[PDB]
């Protein structure tokens, strides 16, 4: 009954928090302590989510690379007593979001799924960022979709339905996979299946998440390969 | 100097002619002999090219599955004295263009290129067809681009430059790979590199090949891995 699985990428398939922490400490040396940089990374992600919320209200799309770059410039001025960055380093730091590493279950989970389903990315990141993330995270897709293709971010209905028509299948034949409830709820509005992936470390050891009970979505799993088993995909 | 290679798919990476010939003979049984069906397949390809030519001159885009469907309906009326097809069979025959098998060099050639470059399809086929062709032809891409995304077919400039914008690179950082000269000449007009792959059997054993001289395009090869070697990509194990 499903033909394709569409995936959230940042956080759902990739550990962006550990990636961005190590990336920044690699670019900036002992100019910044780990505790301060991790705090910057958490506010960076928060800045990103807040700007996308405003843009969704405004019915606007804008390059997400620019969203990361501009919010980082803002944070760099706020933390300017503790450390500084040249313009070149700002570009290298922003590049960290295009170098996300994946959770360990992800590459083999996707391969297990492909025996029965098309697998495609549906990310709010720009098209070039998700292509680059495919290399850093070792993701091999049937197709790569981005908000850039549709002029709107998730949860907007044109993203899910544009994905379905591009893929030539019915929305009810799409299973949306995510670690973010808001993206599953939005796929539900257009008729797609829902699969929630719990990522307890998406926001680090002291992170908090709205809890998801069993039965709220069609599937509730702790890895992509667990999802593949519950969908009937043979192992290896 | 290049960041990404963009590929023509039908014919350049896939043997569409053998695919459609065997596919049709499987769906239609003894209703059609091989010789007649091969001639229909050849006219089917010609109608597709003629219709894309017209739409390009009109600056219009249309679904390519519908181009294939409508041309087959036209051909079925021209051959209607010899055999017929139900509407269900027309759908099944049209699906043949979404099941293309690749030339034998293509999977290991694409894998060899990825050590140094992004590789992406840039096809005039619809997005869903190129996604399906990835399975039948075992193509593994960094991204899939279609004329459907841009509202225009190659050779129009909005396809190559739209591809470059999506990939976050300059048109001059793209190497266009194709077995059709017209798609290379148009990529050159936007500043991209050109790589011609000779496919002597694209049109069958007695088919006519474009005869490309040396010096016309940046690269002239007989396989994707030969192209990968000339681009400095390390060999596969």
Residue numbers in the entry:
A (entry chain A): 11 to 246
B (entry chain B): 11 to 247
Task: Reproduce, without paraphrasing, sentences from the article in which this PDB structure was first reported.
Microbial epoxide hydrolases, cis-epoxysuccinate hydrolases (CESHs), have been utilized for commercial production of enantiomerically pure L(+)- and D(−)-tartaric acids for decades. All these three CESH[L]s exhibit high sequence identity (>60%) with L-2-haloacid dehalogenases, which are members of the haloacid dehalogenase (HAD)-like superfamily. Studies have shown that both RhCESH[L] and KlCESH[L] adopt a two-step catalytic reaction mechanism by 18O-labeling studies.
Although the previously proposed catalytic triad of RhCESH[L] consists of D18, H190, and D193 (22), D193 should not be the catalytic residue in the catalytic triad because D193 does not form direct interaction with H190 in the solved RhCESH[L] structure. To elucidate the mechanism of inactivation caused by D193 mutation, we determined the crystal structure of RhCESH[L]-D193A and RhCESH[L]-D193N. Comparison of these structures with the wild-type RhCESH[L] structure shows that these mutations did not lead to significant changes in the overall structure (with an r.m.sd less than 0.24 Å). However, the mutations of D193 disrupted a salt bridge with K164 and resulted in a significant conformation change of D18 which subsequently formed a new salt bridge with K164. This explains why the mutation of D193 caused the loss of enzyme catalytic activity.
